[PDB]
């Protein structure tokens, strides 16, 4: 098997700057004077899309800012000038020999100004409560960078069991991330306490953003 | 316009069988070399199988890990590629893409899950704001306790797409949970109705939940 090893694993580049992504093959992918190295872009929720073929040749309707170079065992994808929509995972792929193989992928993150999250808190629905479950949800929307900490409190007391955090991939238009944090309880435990709080701590402030409700109110 | 649509994915027990189909159009199908590729978080993108054109004797080839278990075939008169999978294993779980002209064109993919766990329909709960306040208002939808992947979630049947974040599903002791948030201006809701639409093909579940404000 021809093994493709990409580097780096990920990369954060400012708008208008160069992104350089490498791919090393374990043996030569040269083949009748043509290096059989292709590159793909995979945006969130989508299949891989073919960008470059035969190392350096442009796929149909692929923007000029994507170019590929190399031969033998060492290849690169250069993206310049980088735009918001280039947020994606990029894969190299080899057609010299069966089995056809892909690299591990390199994640390109588009850098932008730091942005604090907009935080919203949601008690359990009426419907979920009649099931016997109880889920308290915090959305932390439209922030940068991705790195964030959320802390749940019940009647002031911190709580770590039963919390699940899921981030979106970076947005193609505004370059931000969003995140859901979900505290899952038994209904019985939810109705034993009154005060629910989620505290988001982000790079943008030492002071956390606190969002809260009381089960009694309205 | 090139178009690849794969079907036939879903849940199956370890040791069981499944047949995937790939319908193609927008290129001379009988000349095309077609492949299947799968994707998983563990193994990344894996080429699975190749079937060459009539001029190349419909010659097949396979990834070492599926030899003897998977069979690729094609019906040139219907523009369809098939992938027969026998003695399936949990490591075969993933998203299976049909590709044409080797990897020039790709379908959206169909999800295969190999597990002895059972199909379970989601519960879908509307998330209206706290009982009781800015320029903007954020609503939500919680899809809880389903298996296997995937679900599709839209707002007002696709009409409302900007200001939406749909969060990746996570595993909560055997069952999947996901959320979606939607943010509109305050004059929009509750004046105009906002509905969360959730489909779970594996359980034949289609559910619409209107986001109602909370009564005490």
């Amino acid at each position: 098997d021809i093994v493709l090893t990409q580097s780096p694993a990920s990369l954060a580049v400012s708008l208008g700057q160069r992104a350089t992504i490498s791919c090393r093959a374990s043996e030569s992918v040269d083949n009748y004077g043509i290096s059989s190295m292709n590159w793909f872009q995979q945006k969130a929720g989508q299949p891989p899309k073919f960008l470059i073929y035969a190392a350096s040749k442009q796929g149909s309707g692929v923007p000029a800012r994507f170019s590929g170079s190399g031969s033998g065992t060492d290849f690169s994808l250069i993206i310049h000038p980088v735009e918001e929509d280039d947020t994606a995972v990029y894969f190299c792929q080899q057609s010299k020999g069966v089995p056809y193989t892909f690299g591990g992928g390199t994640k390109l993150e588009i850098k932008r100004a730091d942005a604090a999250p907009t935080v919203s808190i949601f008690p359990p629905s009426s419907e979920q409560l009649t099931s016997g479950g109880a889920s308290v949800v915090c959305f932390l929307n439209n922030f940068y960078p991705k790195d964030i900490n959320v802390k749940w409190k019940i009647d002031g007391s911190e709580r770590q069991n039963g919390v699940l955090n899921s981030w979106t991939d970076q947005d193609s238009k505004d370059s931000t991330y969003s995140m859901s944090s979900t505290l899952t309880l038994t209904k019985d435990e939810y109705e034993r306490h009154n005060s629910y709080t989620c505290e988001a701590t982000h790079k943008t402030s030492t002071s956390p953003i606190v969002k809260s409700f009381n089960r009694n109110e309205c | 316009e090139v178009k690849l649509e794969e079907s036939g994915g879903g849940l199956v027990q370890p040791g069981g069988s499944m047949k995937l189909s790939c319908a193609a159009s927008g290129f001379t199908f009988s000349d095309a070399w077609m492949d299947w590729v799968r994707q998983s978080p563990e193994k990344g993108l894996e080429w699975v199988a190749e079937i060459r054109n009539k001029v190349n004797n419909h010659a097949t080839n396979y990834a070492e890990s599926v030899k003897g278990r998977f069979t690729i075939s094609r019906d040139d008169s219907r523009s369809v590629v098939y992938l027969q999978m026998n003695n399936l294993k949990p490591e075969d779980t993933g998203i299976y893409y049909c590709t044409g002209l080797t990897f020039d064109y790709w379908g959206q993919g169909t999800t295969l899950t190999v597990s002895s766990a059972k199909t379970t329909a989601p519960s879908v709960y509307p998330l209206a704001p706290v009982c009781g306040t800015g320029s903007s208002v954020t609503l939500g939808c919680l899809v809880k306790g389903y298996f296997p992947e995937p679900v599709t979630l839209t707002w007002n049947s696709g009409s409302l797409s900007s200001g939406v974040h749909t969060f990746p599903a996570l595993l909560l002791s055997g069952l999947y949970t996901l959320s979606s948030s939607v943010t509109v201006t305050s004059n929009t809701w509750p004046s105009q109705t906002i509905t969360c639409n959730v489909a779970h093909p594996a359980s034949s579940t289609k559910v619409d939940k209107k986001i109602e404000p909370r009564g005490p």
Binding site: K57 | L101, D104
Partner: peptide
């Protein structure tokens, strides 16, 4: 190195 054709621009090269 004939044209690729059915093989695709990403496919392997012949003869």
């Amino acid at each position: 190195p004939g044209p690729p054709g059915g093989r695709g621009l990403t496919g392997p090269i012949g003869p």
